[PDB]
RNA sequence: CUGUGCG
């Protein structure tokens, strides 16, 4: 790096977009949208191409982002596993011949 | 020619006999448009002299082929057996030689004489000699300085005890009082018989009293039978033009049939239909309103009824069924288009309302009318009301179609009107007005005004006018009201005097709009001259005689009596009277340039055009050379040659030492040569080293004509204010004669210094050295010249051109005017045609004009129709020529100014009017004799001081702009009426642009915030009334001055936009979201033509595809675009009378080089009311048809702005017209964001409380922060076009180009936001960016009022990342650490190698 | 994706907002991540905001919300004499 | 530099001119603009003592 | 292209000029992909040789 | 070349 680095230091990237986001929530409820997250200056997470770190906790949101989602909001709390420890519950019905 | 006539059915110079009749075509082939036009004439006219003879008829054809293109086998045997035919003439005559090749190269080569070409014979004719004998005889030039200051010491010796001493000065002392006593003689009438009373005087004025004191003490399913009146009559009113019947006849009647059955449907199922709706709605005594505006008797229209259904039955089944099967969508008709319409009922019903006609008083006491002076402030509102209304019905009667009468006539004095039209015009909740005339047209008619209370029609009276010239006050009951309201405030100093001049102020308005005159706009401007000369010291003797103005009516003396009491209680008294003298110059110029309220278009033609050949001949005839129709080829007799060498000779004889001949048309010698003399030799302010030399069949030429044509002009007038302005069309070879002196005087002129005619540079140096001048108390001279044009001769340009050096910048050679002294030599025997029209009506006919015609018409010759003189230089011909000669000679005037009274005189000229500032060393009353010699000086030129020239240190004035100590006069009114006048309305895009930049340049000029939101309302009830509706674009109502100062046409609709959407949450999220992508795309990033492709698809996807980019899901998308408006002008543009946008249009206007506006917004109300809107497939539609697809929707999103905001679904009936407007937000956002700066994103706060007297006047700068690299040029705009819409570059673009190499070869290639920023502006219509890019902002400063700054919103730009990018402070410490650390491993030169080649070099960048 | 494969009884619901950094599904505190700001920040952005009020509301919510984390990092200093320009005594008293 | 020794309100005054703040002004508009309110109306800036 | 500029360095032993055209070079592109202003004026400065 | 539009 020609700036030594000295550019940003990505640590500070996202802990000023993170810092951003919440003192902009703490004056109005808003939706945790991509609305919300697009339209902040400090969202400068979808460039830094070596995206190994994410902000704190939305790390999937973020990864869904450079795959250009359009979701709205849903339970994003990947800490306890929802892709993981699912109950399997599973069965099949009858059919109908075309 | 066989190629040519085979194109129009012609024969193998072409007869078609077949019958009684023949066609005969003659063509003719010339590839230059001047010989083109000359040989199409002479064609024309040799043709049209044979059937005169031929019919004692003739189809007659010319074919002027401008080419010689063929269609035998293909382009090969055309122009090479011509080039190889002069070829072999060149290898084996002498002027046809010439002519053969001279006649075909292209248009221009070796054929386009420009002012290098004398190269044909110079020849003579026996007459040359003489000429400059009698032109050149006394020009020497070359005489010394000294002997020419002796020579004007002695003749200033001369002059101060000969004609000064003696008293025939022209100029004089002031004498205030006695300016105000002459002003009372002249104006004041004290002689006359009339009232006292505006009202009893003007016939219209009473009428407007009568209907508004008339509707304020009486009044001022009820409203649903009448809207159904008023569509059925909207329905056959459709019917009525589009000739779906064979004969107009039976057009109206059938109309009528139908009209009368739907009142018998309504007379039964109602209990009182026309007792009570009808007698309070559209219904007179004894007449029921008609198609075409007409009111016919119900009886007589019965009558007619009888016939054609009794003569000729079964005329109703087939009436209808031509009907029926011709428009199946105006079938609403349904019981009325049927059999007898109960004719029983009918006479009952007309024997119930029983009421007297309307008399239409055709003649021309008490004075009850409540002395307006002594009239409340709802009152007056209420006449100015009365009178749009009234105006706004003229001006609809003005657009009333020419039909036929069905009933038989029996002026006089009086006419029972039965078959009259009549305009409605809506008062009160029950008395509506009735406007009745009987003409139709365009012409003045003889109009009466009837009110209708309860039925009751009233006689309101009757008048005699011509309704094109009542367009000003149709919809302008509130800004005229806001002027005198601003007007009466600006004398808030003695409040008292206000009191008195208000009331009188809004009576000289209106009588002023009740009576447009000529005589009052030159009474106004007369008295505008006076106010300039009382506010100075010295004026001219000859003042008061020119601003007297024949009254020949009451109307004219009302206004006269009200402007000049005016003028006296401002200005009289003998202490206390001139308390703020500022204001009340201030006031009463703009009560003078009232004047511009008065519409300026010729209320007779025909007398206008006479008076104008009166102006073009009196001074010729006066003179002593009006030789008449002297040869038109350029062959002149022996005595027009005499007539015309005197001519000369008696301009050219005028002395030194004479003062009896200060007034006649000539120049002295002795005079000029002293002029040339001290210009020559560097002895003047300007100089005769110039720089960027001018210097850039007609066969045999002479110093008469070239044999091609006569320099033949056809005299005209232009519509001014005062007085019509000369006017001279000239053929084409004489227009380019005119262009080429114009060129070369243009640029002598931009080598010169003090001219400023087309140098903007140095009319704002002009303007800052008044100003500075007024405020130092110099001696400013506003000086007008009288009869510039009709005085002025070519040869007084040959007599200076001869002697000027004009040296070359690089040369010194002295560079030969040989071409341009034979053009101007062309010009002296010039031709100008009088116009047909005053010839006629000068053949069917005291007046020195008229007795000229009578003496020319037999006596000496035959009908005149041509005038050759040697003065009369034509206005606009050698417009530049003579602010050449105006310049030096000024020049010289004040050399010897500084020589003889030891003054520093600075002068600026304008060919017509100048200014001379002078700075006097060590009240004016010991320079009065120093003014007398400048005038006397003059007048031995051609530049007679004009009595309209002032001489004071109070006031200056130039260009229409008057200077005042310590400020500016913002001449309100002028600005005003030109906002209110000239509405162009073609469009009602371009009518609210036009109308937008009116009101900013305006502004400028401190009108108020106050009148333009007026304004702007009225021009959106104009628009409204047209039927287009109102729009979320057009005129920008409650604005402020940072709408104006530091904003553009895009940021006002864009705060138009926002006041649309109160309580901003959503235009707030489309700013956040523009600025977003903007600080995407300046940032730099990846952002320059996906945003091409993603806008090209229209309003919805590109908006949805804009949003895409934030974080704007399905749900805030179609939140988004829930907010619609009907946008008619969708499919491209509408149709009045491949759609490319207007950008390509502004751009080709760009690189390329009569009606009267009552007549245009009536065709303007007419297209917009017929099929003018496009659906994509070629149909057009009415207006009416797509508005009446909207559905009541109601659910808070079309409730927020009704009729301009719509919903989704509220439009799902017509959905093709059908915009999101905020995409039109966004794209005016990030255009702004473009053009201004980033202060366009923030949201709007305001000050809290904030006190500045509504006076506090003070000028303001354009706060614009503009960020597209400030050049923009042309080629930008071209490259980038070409670039992103090539298939739109090489179509409908460039076809007429020769200069696209530069624009090819990347000429400063990608612009910063010329890709995106052009597209916003490419794709909306009513956006329009590159236009204002391409242009500077006119203005440079905004005179505004305190009281409007304190009030303006405060918006600036708020950086979004919170301070948070760099904090610069880091930036430089970075880079200095970075630097001193990387020295500090090996030496390194300090150079600019070893600091741009560094990374932390940002300091380029942060502005 | 989040979307219900091209089919579905039940679509476009259960939004999640954000008040005080707290996530709340439908009005229940889900949790607060901790974010550090050390003062200077904050002040930075309480430099652009847009009126009085909304500074009032994101100054008087900021403590409840550093009740869940732990940072007095923020310069004591010189520094808060500056964001002393918004003079909010009641809002640094209101917490305790 | 002040005015061009001009009272500036009534514009007919060279005389025992008291300058308001950047321009002159004469005795009785002095006086007149005086007893009826504080400021000038002409440059709106206090007037003198 | 990087074998290319492989043996120019190699030609340009103990490289402290073609190191240079290398610092340049990365200026250059720092300005350019880093976005600032440099798309097309390259193109008319590289077409005269 | 064609208008029904001041509420
Ligand atoms: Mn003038
Ligand atoms: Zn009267
Ligand atoms: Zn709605
Ligand atoms: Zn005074
Ligand atoms: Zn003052």
Avoid at chain 2, 89 to 106: F, M, V
């Amino acid at each position: 790096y020609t700036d030594w680095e000295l550019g940003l230091s990505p640590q500070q990237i996202c802990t000023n977009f993170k810092t951003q986001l919440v003192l902009s929530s703490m004056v109005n409820p808003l939706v945790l949208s991509t609305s919300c997250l697009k339209s902040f200056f400090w969202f400068n997470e979808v460039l830094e191409l070596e995206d190994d770190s994410q902000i704190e906790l939305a790390e999937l949101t973020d990864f869904a982002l450079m795959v250009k989602n359009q979701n709205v909001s849903r339970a994003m709390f990947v800490e306890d596993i929802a892709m993981g420890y699912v109950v399997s519950n599973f069965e099949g019905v009858r059919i109908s011949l075309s | 020619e066989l190629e040519s006539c085979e194109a129009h059915a012609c024969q193998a110079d072409g007869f078609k006999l077949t019958g009684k009749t023949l066609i005969l075509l003659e063509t003719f082939v010339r590839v230059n448009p001047d010989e083109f036009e000359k040989k199409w004439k002479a064609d024309m006219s040799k043709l049209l002299n044979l059937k005169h003879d031929l019919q004692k008829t003739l189809v007659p054809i010319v074919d002027g082929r401008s080419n010689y293109n063929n269609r035998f086998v293909a382009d090969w045997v055309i122009e090479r057996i011509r080039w190889l035919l002069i070829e072999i003439l060149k290898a084996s005559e002498d002027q046809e030689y010439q002519r053969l090749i001279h006649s075909l190269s292209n248009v221009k080569n070796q054929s386009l004489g420009l002012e290098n070409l004398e190269h044909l014979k110079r020849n003579s004719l026996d007459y040359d000699e003489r000429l400059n004998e009698s032109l050149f005889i006394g020009l020497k030039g070359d005489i010394r300085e000294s002997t020419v200051r002796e020579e004007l010491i002695k003749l200033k010796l001369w002059f101060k005890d000969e004609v000064f001493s003696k008293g025939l000065g022209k100029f004089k002392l002031t004498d205030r009082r006695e300016l105000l006593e002459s002003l009372s003689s002249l104006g004041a009438h004290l002689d006359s018989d009339v009232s006292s009373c505006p009202f009893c005087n003007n016939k219209l004025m009473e009428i407007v009293y009568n209907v508004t004191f008339s509707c304020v003490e009486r009044t001022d399913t009820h409203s649903n039978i009448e809207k159904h009146y008023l569509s059925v009559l909207s329905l056959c009113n459709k019917i009525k033009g589009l000739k779906v019947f064979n004969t107009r006849r039976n057009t109206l009647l059938f109309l009528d049939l139908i009209m009368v059955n739907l009142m018998v449907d309504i007379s039964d199922s109602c209990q009182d239909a026309i007792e009570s709706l009808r007698k309070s709605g559209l219904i007179v005594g004894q007449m029921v309103m008609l198609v075409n505006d007409r009111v016919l008797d119900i009886l007589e229209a019965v009558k007619l009824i009888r016939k054609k259904i009794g003569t000729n039955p079964n005329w109703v089944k087939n009436c209808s069924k031509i009907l029926e099967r011709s428009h199946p969508e105006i079938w609403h008709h349904l019981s009325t288009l049927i059999k007898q319409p109960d004719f029983n009922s009918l006479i009952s019903i007309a024997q119930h309302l029983v009421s007297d006609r309307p008399i239409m008083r055709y003649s021309v006491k008490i004075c009850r009318h409540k002395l307006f002076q002594e009239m409340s402030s709802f009152e007056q509102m209420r006449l100015f009301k009365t009178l749009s209304s009234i105006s706004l019905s003229l001006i609809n009667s003005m657009k009333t179609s020419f039909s036929s009468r069905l009933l038989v006539n029996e002026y006089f004095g009086n006419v029972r009107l039965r078959e009259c039209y009549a305009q409605r015009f809506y008062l009160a909740e029950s008395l509506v007005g009735f406007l009745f005339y009987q003409k139709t047209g365009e012409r003045s008619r003889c109009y009466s005004v009837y009110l209708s209370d309860n039925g009751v029609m009233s006689e309101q009276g009757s008048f005699y006018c011509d309704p094109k010239r009542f367009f000003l006050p149709v919809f302008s009951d509130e800004v005229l009201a806001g002027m005198c309201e601003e007007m009466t405030s600006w004398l808030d100093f003695d409040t008292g005097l206000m009191n008195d001049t208000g009331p009188i102020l809004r009576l000289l308005v209106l009588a002023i709009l009740c009576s447009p005159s000529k005589r009052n706009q030159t009474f106004l401007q007369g008295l505008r001259y006076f106010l300039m000369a009382f506010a100075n010291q010295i004026h001219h003797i000859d003042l008061t005689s020119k601003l007297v103005v024949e009254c020949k009516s009451s109307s004219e003396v009302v206004v006269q009596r009200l402007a000049v009491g005016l003028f006296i209680r401002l200005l009289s008294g003998e202490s206390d009277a001139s308390l703020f003298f500022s204001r009340r110059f201030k006031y009463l110029l703009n009560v003078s340039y009232l004047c511009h309220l008065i519409t300026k278009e010729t209320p007779d033609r025909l007398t206008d055009q006479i008076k104008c050949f009166e102006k073009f001949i009196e001074p010729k005839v006066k003179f002593g050379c009006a030789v008449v129709n002297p040869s038109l080829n350029g062959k002149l007799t022996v005595d027009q040659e005499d007539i015309m060498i005197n001519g000369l000779k008696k301009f050219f004889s005028k002395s030194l030492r004479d003062t009896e001949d200060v007034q006649t048309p000539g120049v002295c010698k002795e005079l000029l040569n002293y002029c040339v003399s001290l210009f020559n030799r560097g002895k003047l302010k300007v100089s005769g080293e110039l720089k960027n030399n001018p210097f850039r069949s007609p066969t045999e030429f002479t110093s008469i004509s070239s044999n091609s044509g006569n320099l033949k002009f056809g005299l005209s007038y232009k519509e001014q204010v005062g007085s019509n302005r000369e006017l001279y069309v000239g053929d084409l070879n004489t227009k380019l004669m005119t262009r080429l002196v114009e060129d070369f005087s243009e640029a002598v002129g931009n080598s010169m210094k003090y001219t400023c005619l087309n140098s903007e540079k140095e009319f704002e140096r002009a303007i800052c050295d008044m100003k500075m001048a007024v405020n130092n108390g110099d001696l400013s001279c506003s000086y007008d010249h009288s009869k510039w044009g009709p005085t002025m001769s070519p040869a007084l340009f040959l007599a200076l051109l001869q002697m000027l050096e004009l040296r070359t910048p690089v040369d010194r050679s002295k560079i030969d005017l040989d071409s341009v002294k034979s053009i101007l030599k062309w010009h002296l025997h010039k031709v100008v045609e009088v116009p047909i029209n005053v010839a006629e009506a000068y053949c069917i006919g005291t007046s020195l004009s008229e007795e000229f015609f009578h003496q020319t018409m037999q006596l000496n010759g035959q009908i005149p129709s041509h005038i050759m003189s040697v003065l009369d230089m034509g206005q606009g011909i050698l417009h530049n020529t003579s602010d050449l000669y105006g310049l030096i000679t000024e020049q010289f005037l004040c050399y010897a100014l500084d020589l003889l009274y030891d003054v520093i005189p600075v002068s600026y000229t304008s060919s017509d009017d100048q200014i001379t500032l002078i700075k006097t060393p060590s009240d004016a009353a010991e320079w009065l004799e120093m003014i007398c010699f400048h005038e006397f000086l003059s007048s031995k030129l051609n530049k007679f001081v004009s009595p309209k020239s002032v001489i004071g240190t109070f006031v200056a004035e130039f260009k229409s702009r008057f200077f005042v100590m310590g400020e500016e006069t913002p001449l309100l009114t002028k600005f005003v009426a030109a906002a209110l006048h000239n509405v162009k309305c073609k469009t009602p895009t371009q009518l609210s642009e036009t109308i937008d930049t009116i009101c900013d340049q305006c502004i400028a000029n401190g009108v108020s915030t106050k009148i333009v939101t007026r304004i702007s309302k009225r021009v959106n009830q104009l628009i409204r009334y047209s039927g287009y509706g109102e729009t979320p674009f057009g005129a920008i109502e409650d604005q402020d001055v940072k709408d104006w100062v530091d904003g553009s046409r895009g940021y006002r609709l864009q705060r138009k936009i926002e006041a649309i959407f109160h309580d901003d949450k959503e235009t707030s999220f489309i700013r956040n979201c523009a600025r977003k992508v903007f600080n995407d795309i300046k940032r730099g990033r990846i952002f320059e033509e996906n945003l091409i492709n993603l806008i090209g698809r229209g309003g919805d996807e590109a908006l949805t595809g804009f949003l895409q980019y934030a974080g704007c899901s399905e749900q805030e998308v179609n939140r988004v675009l829930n907010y619609r408006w009907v946008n008619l002008s969708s499919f491209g543009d509408l149709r009045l009378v491949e759609e490319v946008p207007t950008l390509i249009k502004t751009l080709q206007s760009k690189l390329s080089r009569q009606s009267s506006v009552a007549s245009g917004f009536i065709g303007f109300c007419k297209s917009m009311g017929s099929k003018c809107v496009r659906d994509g497939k070629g149909g057009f539609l009415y207006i009416k048809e797509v508005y009446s697809g909207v559905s009541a929707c109601t659910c808070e999103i079309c409730a927020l702005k009704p009729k301009i905001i719509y919903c989704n679904n509220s439009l799902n009936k017509v959905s093709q017209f059908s915009k999101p407007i905020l995409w039109d937000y966004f794209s005016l956002v990030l255009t702004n964001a473009c053009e201004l700066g980033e202060w366009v994103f923030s949201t709007v706060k305001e000050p809290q409380k904030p006190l500045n007297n509504q006076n506090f006047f003070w000028a303001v700068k354009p706060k614009v922060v503009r960020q597209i690299e400030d050049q923009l040029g042309m080629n930008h705009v071209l490259q980038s076009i070409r670039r992103n819409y090539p298939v739109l570059f090489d179509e409908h673009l460039t076809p007429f180009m020769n200069d696209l190499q530069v624009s090819r070869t990347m000429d400063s290639g990608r612009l910063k936001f010329l890709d995106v920023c052009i597209a916003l502006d490419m794709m909306n219509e009513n956006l329009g960016i590159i236009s204002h890019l391409l242009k500077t902002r006119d203005n440079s400063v905004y005179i505004v009022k305190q009281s409007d700054c304190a009030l303006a919103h405060i918006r600036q730009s708020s950086y979004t990342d919170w301070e948070l990018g760099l904090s610069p402070q880091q930036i430089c410490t970075n880079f200095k650490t970075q630097l001193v650390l990387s020295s500090m491993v090996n030496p390194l030169v300090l150079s600019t190698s070893c600091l741009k080649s560094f990374f932390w070099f940002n300091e380029v960048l942060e502005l | 994706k989040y979307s219900y494969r091209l089919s579905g009884p039940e679509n476009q619901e259960d939004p999640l907002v954000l008040k005080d950094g707290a996530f709340y599904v439908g009005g229940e505190r889900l949790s607060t991540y901790k974010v550090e700001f050390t003062g200077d920040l904050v002040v930075k952005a309480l430099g652009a905001l847009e009126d009085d009020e909304s500074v009032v509301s994101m100054l008087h919510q900021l403590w409840p919300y550093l009740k869940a984390t732990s940072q007095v990092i923020l310069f004591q200093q010189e520094d808060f004499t500056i964001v002393h320009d918004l003079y909010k005594k009641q809002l640094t008293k209101s917490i305790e | 530099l002040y005015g061009r020794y001009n009272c500036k309100c009534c514009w007919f005054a060279d005389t025992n001119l008291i300058t308001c703040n950047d321009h002159y002004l004469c005795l009785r508009c002095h006086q007149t603009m005086l007893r009826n309110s504080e400021l000038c109306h002409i440059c709106w800036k206090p007037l003198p003592t």
